[model samples]
Target: LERPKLYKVMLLNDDYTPREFVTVVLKAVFRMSEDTGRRVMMTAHRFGSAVVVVCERDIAETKAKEATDLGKEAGFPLMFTTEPE
Candidate 1:
């Protein structure tokens, strides 16, 4: 069988997105450790974006959408996206 397509789940940093909130979503959606989540959050803060996870296309899309939904529910402009890896 052919291998599945790999995709990257990305976090797009925004001014309106709280630092704490980003880590929260990262932990909830990706199950990152407390310190790991903070590190990922800070990387995005500094670089404007970061790759949160790499997985198959479906998994990446689902997680990216779920993470973005969490921010939308909280009334933040936080964004997550998917791209081919």
Candidate 2:
């Protein structure tokens, strides 16, 4: 049987989003290493995007919304997107 649809949660680059803040969030939320968080930032940054994770729809959506909320609340205006992978 096929599993439920998986989703990709990505970080969208924006001028108002602080690079360092995103790195910290990446490490905390995604359990990424210190350097890896930065690498992903640039990885997506190089092309203006990066993946946070690939998971089931609910988890991806929940995490994306939560992370995006944290950013907005923290005054970073950070944006996280969730979509079918």
Candidate 3:
């Protein structure tokens, strides 16, 4: 059987969302440990975006939607997208 390929979920930065809040959302929604969450946050801050997680396509989509919804509800200008890996 062929192994399933993973998808990368990327977070886009915007002026409206605080870096620390992005880190918190990543940890809470993606179940990332604090260190990893902070790392991703810093990467996003420095690079203007970052891959927050890698998982199956379905999971990636779900997470993207969840993150988008949470961001919207929080009045952030956050956005998420995905790519095959």
Candidate 4:
């Protein structure tokens, strides 16, 4: 049989979330480099959303929820979602 399917973690952009806050979450949650984090954040800034990471369903969901919670606790509307790869 084939291996378990993977999922993509997506970052959804919003007007309320500060760019610096997004970069912080990107590095904190995804372990991305400062440059990488900025690039990723900019991508979402330019577009509606950006693919943050790809992993197994469980891990993907966990990371997405964690990232989203960080924003929520900070009084931001930042959002993250998991999707089939």
Highest TM-score among the candidates is held by which one? 4
Best by lDDT: 4
**Per-residue lDDT over 50-73 for candidate 1, one digit per residue giving the tens place of the 0 to 100 score:** 888899899999999999999999
Root-mean-square deviation per candidate: 1.1, 1.4, 1.6, 1.1
- Clashing residue pairs in candidate 4 are none
- The worst-scoring run of ten residues by lDDT in candidate 2 lies at 36-45
The 0-to-1 C-alpha lDDT of every candidate, in the order given, reads: 0.88, 0.84, 0.85, 0.90
Residue 34 Cα positional deviation in candidate 1, in Å, after optimal superposition: 1.7
The weakest ten consecutive residues by lDDT in model 1 span 36-45
* Count of steric clashes across candidates, in order: 0, 1, 0, 0
Cα lDDT tens digits for candidate 2, 1-85: 9768899999887888878788788877778787887877787768778887999899998889988988999888788898788
In the predicted model 3, the residue pairs found to clash are none
In candidate 3, what are the lDDT values of residues 1-85, reduced to their tens digit?
Answer: 8999999999886778877777778877888888897777678778987898899999999999998888899898888888998
Tell me how far candidate 2 lies from the true structure as C-alpha RMSD in angstroms.
Answer: 1.4
- Least well predicted 10-residue stretch by lDDT in candidate 4: 36-45
lDDT of 3 at 28: 77
Residue 10 CA displacement from its true place in model 4, Å:
0.5
Between prediction 3 and prediction 4, which has the larger TM-score? 4
